[PDB]
Design a protein around this ligand. Sequence first.
Ligand SMILES: NC(=O)C1=CN([C@@H]2O[C@H](COP(=O)(O)OP(=O)(O)OC[C@H]3O[C@@H](n4cnc5c(N)ncnc54)[C@H](OP(=O)(O)O)[C@@H]3O)[C@@H](O)[C@H]2O)C=CC1
Ligand SMILES: NC(=O)C1=CN([C@@H]2O[C@H](COP(=O)(O)OP(=O)(O)OC[C@H]3O[C@@H](n4cnc5c(N)ncnc54)[C@H](OP(=O)(O)O)[C@@H]3O)[C@@H](O)[C@H]2O)C=CC1
Ligand SMILES: NC(=O)C1=CN([C@@H]2O[C@H](COP(=O)(O)OP(=O)(O)OC[C@H]3O[C@@H](n4cnc5c(N)ncnc54)[C@H](OP(=O)(O)O)[C@@H]3O)[C@@H](O)[C@H]2O)C=CC1
Ligand SMILES: NC(=O)C1=CN([C@@H]2O[C@H](COP(=O)(O)OP(=O)(O)OC[C@H]3O[C@@H](n4cnc5c(N)ncnc54)[C@H](OP(=O)(O)O)[C@@H]3O)[C@@H](O)[C@H]2O)C=CC1
Lengths: 343, 370, 339, 371
Amino acid sequence: MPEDRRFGYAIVGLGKYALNQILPGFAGCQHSRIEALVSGNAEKAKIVAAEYGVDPRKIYDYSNFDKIAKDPKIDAVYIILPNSLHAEFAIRAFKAGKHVMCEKPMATSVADCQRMIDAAKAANKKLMIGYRCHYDPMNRAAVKLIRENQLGKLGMVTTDNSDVMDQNDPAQQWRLRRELAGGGSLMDIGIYGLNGTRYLLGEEPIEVRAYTYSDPNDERFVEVEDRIIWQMRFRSGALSHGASSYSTTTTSRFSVQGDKAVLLMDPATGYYQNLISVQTPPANNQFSAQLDHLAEAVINNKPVRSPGEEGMQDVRLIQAIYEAARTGRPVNTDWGYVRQGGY
Amino acid sequence: ATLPAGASQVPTTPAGRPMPYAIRRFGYAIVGLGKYALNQILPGFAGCQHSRIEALVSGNAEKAKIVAAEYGVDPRKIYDYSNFDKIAKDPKIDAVYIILPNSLHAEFAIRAFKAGKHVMCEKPMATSVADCQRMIDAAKAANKKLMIGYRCHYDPMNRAAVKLIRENQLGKLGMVTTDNSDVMDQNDPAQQWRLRRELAGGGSLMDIGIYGLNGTRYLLGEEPIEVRAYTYSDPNDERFVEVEDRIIWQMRFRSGALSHGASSYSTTTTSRFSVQGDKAVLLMDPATGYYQNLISVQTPGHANQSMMPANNQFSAQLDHLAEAVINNKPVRSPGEEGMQDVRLIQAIYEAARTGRPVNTDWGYVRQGGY
Amino acid sequence: RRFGYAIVGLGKYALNQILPGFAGCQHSRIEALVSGNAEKAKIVAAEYGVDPRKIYDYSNFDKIAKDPKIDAVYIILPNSLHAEFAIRAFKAGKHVMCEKPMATSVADCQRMIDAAKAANKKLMIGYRCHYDPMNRAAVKLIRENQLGKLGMVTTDNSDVMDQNDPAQQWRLRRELAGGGSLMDIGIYGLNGTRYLLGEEPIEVRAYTYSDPNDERFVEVEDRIIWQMRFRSGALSHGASSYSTTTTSRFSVQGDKAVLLMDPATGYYQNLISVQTPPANNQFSAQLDHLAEAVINNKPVRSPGEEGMQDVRLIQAIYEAARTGRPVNTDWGYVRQGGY
Amino acid sequence: ATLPAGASQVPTTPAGRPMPYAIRRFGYAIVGLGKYALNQILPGFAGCQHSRIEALVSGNAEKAKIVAAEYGVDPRKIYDYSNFDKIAKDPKIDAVYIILPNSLHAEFAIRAFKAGKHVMCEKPMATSVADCQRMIDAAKAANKKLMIGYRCHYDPMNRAAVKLIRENQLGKLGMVTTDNSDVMDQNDPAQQWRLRRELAGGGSLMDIGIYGLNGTRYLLGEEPIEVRAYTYSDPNDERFVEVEDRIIWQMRFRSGALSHGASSYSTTTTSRFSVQGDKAVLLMDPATGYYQNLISVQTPGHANQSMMMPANNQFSAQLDHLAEAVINNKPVRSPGEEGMQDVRLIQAIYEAARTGRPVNTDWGYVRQGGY
Ligand SMILES: NC(=O)C1=CN([C@@H]2O[C@H](COP(=O)(O)OP(=O)(O)OC[C@H]3O[C@@H](n4cnc5c(N)ncnc54)[C@H](OP(=O)(O)O)[C@@H]3O)[C@@H](O)[C@H]2O)C=CC1
Ligand SMILES: NC(=O)C1=CN([C@@H]2O[C@H](COP(=O)(O)OP(=O)(O)OC[C@H]3O[C@@H](n4cnc5c(N)ncnc54)[C@H](OP(=O)(O)O)[C@@H]3O)[C@@H](O)[C@H]2O)C=CC1
Ligand SMILES: NC(=O)C1=CN([C@@H]2O[C@H](COP(=O)(O)OP(=O)(O)OC[C@H]3O[C@@H](n4cnc5c(N)ncnc54)[C@H](OP(=O)(O)O)[C@@H]3O)[C@@H](O)[C@H]2O)C=CC1
Ligand SMILES: NC(=O)C1=CN([C@@H]2O[C@H](COP(=O)(O)OP(=O)(O)OC[C@H]3O[C@@H](n4cnc5c(N)ncnc54)[C@H](OP(=O)(O)O)[C@@H]3O)[C@@H](O)[C@H]2O)C=CC1
C-alpha cells in the first residue's frame, strides 16, 4: 500500500539498480522510506535528494558513512554497490548499529559472507540479501502450485538467464572487472537460475557439474566468464541444467518438469511482467514487497525470508560450480545447508 | 584481447560514479480495476510504443493503491467515481479507457468527454442504442475521438483471416457459422452484474455472442439486412432468470450470404467461426481467444492448410487510439461501429422475442472498411 | 461369404464407394448387378468378377427371386425410386438395404416398412455414419459423460452442386430428389445431432434461401438453416448448402467440455477432438451388418423406422421454413436399440 | 432461368445412366503397423500429391487386413517379414518406409534395397554407427535413395525458425537450449522395446532427445566439435534397467556457440527449443509436436512477438519429398549420412556420460546440401 512511514532507509550507491528500480520502489511501500543517501558523487546525490525529497543534510559520502550511527532516523541501510564492496559496508553499517539490506550476490567470497553474518550477530541486527524474486507474486505462485503437487514428482529443471554486456554502461564496467564482480555471468545473473532452481524444487543440490567458455577475442571477457553451463543433481533424484550468458540478449526462462505436468516461467525473474503457465499431457510489486519485508521483520521482530545464510549458500554453490567448471569433474555439495522457514 | 578502458579504469575502492543509464506520449486513465483490466489490459501496456498508464480510477482505494504500485503510477493520480471529473485538470491524461460493467459505459464516457479527454470504451458499447447516440454526440461536441474495444480488430490472426477472404481465396461467400460461449456462475448468482439485466443490458449475446455477430460482419465485409433468432434458458436456473443463456440467430446479407450463430452461458469455452465460399472453407478456432488464435483453410480435394507479430492485440489496440490522435487520423473502431452491433443485438432480441424475421437494412456504412 | 448382394443403380456411391467397399467385407459379396446400361454393367460386372448371367435391369429385376444365392438387395437409385424397388425387391424374399434419404415422402417410407414385414425380411437404411469408427467413438465418449451436460450442437454439411455431373442432375429436380441440400446432405447433420445428443427434437424452426437467378435451385433449395430444441433442454443449429465447397463439421458443447468433429461425415480421414476449458471402414461395416443381423437373428442398427424419422423431421423442417413458424415434432418416436 | 439443359432432362422413371465421375505416381510399402505408422503416417498420406499407400508389411494378418481395407489397399499386397523380400516382384512399390523398433532398421533397409527399392527409415537410423554405414553402402549398391524420417526437417514452422535465423534476425548465435520428454508407460516395461537395450540401443536420448540433438544442429547450422554429458536413473525404477531415463548434454561448436539439453522418460511431455543470439532470442514451444509447432521471437526492449500457409503438413511433405527426389533426379534432404551423424554423436554423448570426460567430435562431417 502507497503511503509509507516508519522504517528509515539509507540508500548506498546511486547507480542503475538503485535509481531505476529501488528508489521508485518506495512509492508502493507501507513502512519503508528514503531517509538518507550515501554517494561518492555530491552533485548526483544532490539531484536525487531533491527528487525524492530527502533532507540534503542526510547525504553522506563513503568516508563519513559511519556517522549514520548518530542518526536514529536511519533504521537500515540498503547496499547497492558493486559485489566486492558489499561486505565492507554491511560490516561498517552493523558497527554503526543499523540493519542491512544487501544486494546479490552477497559477497565475492564465502569468507566475506561469513564475516558479514558474524558482524550482524555481534550487533544483534538483521541481515537481508536483496533477492526480489522471493517477494514476487508470480514466483511465489509458482512455488505454491509445486507444493500443492500440481506438477507431480519433480524430475527436470531447466533455467537460462542472459543479457548483453555493454562496456559503455558504467554499471556494466565493474561487472567486467574480476575483483569488483568476483566472477562473470554466474555471479551476476546465473545466480537467479541457481537460486530459483533451489526454491522451485525446495531442495539443495548434492552434486554439481559445469563447463565455461568465452571467446578469447572478446575484450569483455578477458577476466570474467561470458557463458557458463552447470548441471545439478538433488537428493530427491531431481536433476537440472541451466546456463548464464553475458553475450546473448535478455532471457529469463525457467522450466520445471514433473511426471504430472510441466511449469513454465518466462519471463521468470524480470523487473516488471513475469508470466507462468502449466502444461499437462492483488499483490504488491517485488521491489516494494522486499523493502517492507525488512521493515516488517524489524518492526515486528520476526525472521526474514532472505537471510544472510541464504546469500552465503548461493555464493558457496557458485564457488563449487566454478570449481567444477575448472576441473571438469563433479563437485560434492552435500554440506548440510538448511533453509530457514522454507524456500 | 584487452579489457576496455572503461572497465580497467573503474576504481577498486569506493568511488563516485556517473548518473546511470535510464532503462509514451499518450496517457491513459484506466476505469474499473476488474478482471479484464487487471489480467489483459494493464499488462498489455508493456508492449506498447505510444501509450502508457497515467492514472487509475477505482471504487476500491486499496486496489488502486496496490495496482498503481505494480505498474508505477503516481499514487496521487488514483481517482474514484466521484472526483473522476477532476481528471480535466491533469493534462498528462490523454484518454480514458472505460472497463466498467455495460450499464455504466455511457455515463462515464460522457463525463470523460466533458473533461476534454478522448475515450476508449469496452464492448458492448452501451445497453441502449440511444445511449450509444449520446456517447457519439458527447464526443463530437467535445471534438474528441471515440473508440470501442474490439481487440479482434487488432488481432493479426483475425486480420489475416479478413485478408485471405478479401483476396477471394474462399470464393463467393455463402455461409458463415459462429459459436461463442463460457460457463457463467461460479457460485455467485445475483453477485454477477453480467446476470443482472439492468447492468449487462443482455445475456450471452451482449457479452460474448457479440463476438460472433461482429466477426460475421467483418468476415463477410457487409451488414445484415434481415434477422431471425430463438432463445431458451432452463427456467429452473437462477443464473438466467433475468438475462438469456443460450440464443441462436440466423442472418441474411445483401450479397445472398447467410449465417447462423449462437452464444451460450451454460457451456464450456468455445470460440469458433466458419466461413464457406465456393472455392474453399475457412475455419478459425480459437477465433477470439486472448493469446493464440488459429485459422485453417480447406479446399476440396487438397489437404487442410493452417495459415501462418501474431498476437499483440491488446497492445495493438491501445496504441491505435494513441496514434490516431497524435497523427490526426480516423479510428478503426469508431463509436458508430459499436452502435451498429448494439442496434443489431437489439434487432436480434426483438426477433427472438417475437419469433419472426426483423428487417435491419438501415444502410449502416462501415467507415474505412471492415 | 454366406450373404450375397444385388446392387441396383451403377452410380457414384455405387461404384466409387460401395463396390470397392466390398473389398473389405468378411460376410458379403457383390452377388449380382442391376442396371439400365448393360454396357457399363458389363464393364463393372466384369471387373468385380460377376457372372454376366446375373446382369438384370429395371424390369426382369423380379427374377431375383429365382437365385437363392442373392440374399438381399441394395438400392442405390435416386430418392424418388427408393420405395418402388424396395417393395419390388421384398415381394421376392430378399432383404433390403436402401440408401438415404429413405424416400421422398413419409407415406412411401411406411409402405416400405410394411412390405418388409410382409416378406418377413429385414429393412436397413444406408447410414454409414452409424458404422463409422470415428462417429461411434464420439457417441461413446458422450455417453461416458466426457462433455458433461449437452447444451449446444452445431452442424454444417456442404458441397458445390454441379449441373453437368450425372449423379447430381436428378438432385436438382423436385420430383426425383424430393428436396434439396437438406434431403441430400443436410440429413447427415440432422441424423447426427440425434445420435450424438441421444434424443429427439421436440420442436423445430427453419429458414431457407436460394439465389433467385441460379438455375440449379428452381425446384430444390440451395441453403437451409434449422434450429431445434430437445426434451433435455439442449439446442442445436445446423445448415446444409449446395453452393459452397465441401464441409462436414459437427460440434457438441457440454458444460464440461466441447467435442469437435471435422471432417464429421466424410468417406475417410474423419477426425474428432475433445477440448476442455483399428476397426474396419464404415463402408464395409455397413454391408456386413445386414448380413450379420439376418444370420444371427438380430435387429439392424439402422431400422427402416429410424430412416423414416428423418424423412418426417425433414418434412417438418421444410414446413417450418415454409411458414416461418416453429413446428412441433414431439410425436413420440423411439429409436429402438439406441442411437 | 430454369433447370439446366441436362438437369431438366431425366427420366422420372428408372433408366440408364452413364459412368460416374472419377476420384499419385509413387508406391509406398509401410513396414510395421504400430502406433506411429497407424496414427501419423498412414493418415498422413491423405495430403500427399505424389506418394501413395501401395503395400503393407505386417507381422499380423488380422491387423493388416483391416488396415488394408481402411485405406483401400490391395488385400493381395499384405506381406510379412518372411516373404518381405518378395516385394521385389511388384513394381508398383517404388519405396519402403520402415517403422519398426530401432534394432530392426538396418536389417530391413538392406533387404529392401536388395529388392531394388528406395528406403524411408524412421529415426534413430540404427542401433550402431556400424549398421548406418552398412545401410548407406547397401543403398549405394542398388543405386537407390535412402532417407531418414526427420519430419521436423519438413515442418513449416521448423523451417521458418531456420529461415529467420539464417536471415540474422537473432544475430550471432551463442546459446541453444533443448528439452524433450515424455512419461514412458510404467506397466510391465520388460514388454516395451524402448526399455530393452538390444532393441532400442539406448534410452530417452535415442528415442526423443535426438530431436534436441538434431534441432540444435540445424538451428545453428553447424556441427558440435566437443561434447559433454551426464545421466542418471532411479535405480529402483524397473523401467530403466537397460536404458537411461534422463541424460543431459553440453556441446561446443566451431563458431563458439554453446548448447545444453536433456531428454526424459519420466516427466510430462516437453518439446522446447530456444536459440539465443546477441540480437534476439527464439523460442519454439512446441518445437517438434505432431500438429502445430509454435515459435516466438523475444527481442530486447520490444515485447514477445509470436511468429505465425500451409504450416500443418510435415508428414505429407516428408512422404512426397521422397517421391519428388526420385521422380526428379535430386537428392533427399535427410540422407542416410545425416542419420549416421546423429547416431555417431549419440554414441559420443553416451561415452561422454560414461567416462565423464569431454569427447571430441570434430571429425569433419559436412552437411551435404544444407540444414
Ligand atoms: N538483485 C537484482 O535484481 C539486481 C541487483 N543489482 C546488484 O546491485 C549492485 C549494484 O549494481 P548496479 O546498480 O547494476 O551497479 P551501478 O555501477 O549502476 O551502481 C554502482 C554504484 O555503487 C557505487 N560505487 C561506489 N564505488 C564504486 C566502484 N568502485 N565501482 C562501481 N560503483 C561504485 C556508485 O554510486 P555513487 O556514484 O553514488 O557512489 C555506483 O553508482 C550489484 O551488487 C548488483 O549485482 C543490480 C541489478 C539487478
Ligand atoms: N474486449 C474483451 O475481450 C473483453 C471485454 N470485457 C468487457 O469489459 C467490461 C469489464 O468486464 P470485467 O473486467 O470482466 O468485469 P469485472 O466484473 O471483473 O470488472 C468490473 C469492474 O468495474 C467496477 N465497478 C464499478 N461499479 C460496479 C458495479 N456496480 N458492479 C461491478 N463492478 C463495478 C469494478 O472495479 P473497481 O473495483 O475499480 O471499481 C470492477 O472490478 C465489460 O463491459 C465487458 O463486457 C470483458 C472481458 C473481455
Ligand atoms: N450415403 C452416402 O454416402 C451417399 C448416398 N447417396 C445416395 O445414393 C443414391 C445414389 O446417388 P448417386 O449414385 O450419387 O447418383 P447417380 O445418378 O450417379 O446414382 C444412381 C444410380 O441409379 C440409377 N438410376 C435408375 N434410374 C434412374 C433415374 N431415372 N435417374 C438417374 N439414375 C437412375 C443408375 O444406374 P444405371 O445407369 O446403371 O441404371 C445410377 O447412375 C441417392 O439416393 C443419394 O442421396 C449418394 C452419394 C453418397
Ligand atoms: N519420428 C517420430 O515422430 C516417431 C518415431 N518413432 C519411430 O518409429 C519406430 C517404431 O515406433 P512406433 O510406431 O512407436 O512403435 P510401436 O511399439 O507401436 O511399433 C512397433 C511396430 O513394429 C513392429 N515390430 C516388428 N517386430 C517387432 C518386435 N520385436 N517387437 C515389437 N514390434 C515389432 C510392429 O508391427 P506389426 O504388429 O504390424 O508386426 C509394431 O506394431 C521407431 O524407430 C521409433 O523411433 C516412433 C514414434 C514417433
